């Protein structure tokens, strides 16, 4: 089974608000650790790409900045984890869980985490970055006005989930503020501390 599989490998949680540089740090711990990266925005992004049906509904919620429901976004990282479990040496979720619910159905069905990492950027910053990546075409969801109901909806639903895994025990926070390179030092020596 999936479940029985995943106890002998690692699963990371990195969570950090849109534009907290999350994604991009992701890339650079794949490059340096080789662990497996999944995004579930990229996910549901290629979802939209293929013209279905449901990629209209997806693209509707992502460009209204809303979480898309919890059980479409559990299967298809679900899916994701199945395809690569024989061989990936380490799992980096990208962006889940991003409400309590969602780590809960998370630890239910599929498996624990060992560590959740904490992206922390302030607001001023994360509207910045998606203002400028805003200037060139590809997420139309970058709209100024789409930028304040993704912020809403980070503190609202997701901040409470740091909090619920900081009483656990596993939660090591970056300052998501700097350049990558700084950024990505400060996510080496946590990474470091444990692998
Ligand atoms: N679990 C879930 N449940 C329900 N719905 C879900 C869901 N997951 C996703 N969704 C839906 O999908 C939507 C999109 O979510 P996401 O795909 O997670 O998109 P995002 O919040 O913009 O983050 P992304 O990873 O692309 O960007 P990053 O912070 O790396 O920042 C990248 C930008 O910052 C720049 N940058 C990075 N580091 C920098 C630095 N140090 N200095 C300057 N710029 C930097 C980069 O160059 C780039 O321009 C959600 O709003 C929601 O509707």
Redesign the pocket.
């Known amino acids: 089974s999936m479940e029985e599989k995943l106890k002998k490998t690692n699963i990371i949680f990195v969570v ?9 740090q992701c890339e650079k711990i794949v490059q340096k650790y080789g662990y497996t990266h999944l ?4 996910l ?2 290629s979802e939209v790409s293929s013209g279905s049906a449901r990629g209209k509904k997806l693209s509707e ?2 460009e209204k ?4 429901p ?1 059980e479409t ?1 559990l299967d298809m990282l679900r899916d994701a984890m199945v395809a690569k479990v024989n061989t990936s040496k380490g799992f980096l979720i ?5 409400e309590v619910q ?1 780590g809960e159905e998370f630890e239910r069905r599929i498996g624990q985490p060992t560590l959740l990492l904490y992206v922390d950027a302030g607001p001023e910053t994360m509207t910045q ?2 203002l ?2 805003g200037e060139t075409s590809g ?1 139309v ?1 970058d709209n100024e006005e789409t930028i304040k109901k ?1 912020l809403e ?1 980070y503190y609202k639903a997701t901040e409470p989930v740091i909090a619920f895994y900081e009483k656990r025990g596993i939660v090591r926070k970056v300052n ?1 503020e ?3 390179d700084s ?1 990505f030092s400060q996510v080496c020596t946590h990474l470091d501390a444990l692998l």
Not at 39 to 42: H, I, L, R, V
Not at 65 to 68: D, E, F, H, R, Y
Not at 94 to 98: A, H, I, K, N, S
């Open positions: 950090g608000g849109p534009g907290s540089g999350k994604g991009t995004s579930t925005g990229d549901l992004r919620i992502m900045g809303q979480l898309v919890l976004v990208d962006g889940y869980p991003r969602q970055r998606l400028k990546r997420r969801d993704r909806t998501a700097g350049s990558v950024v």
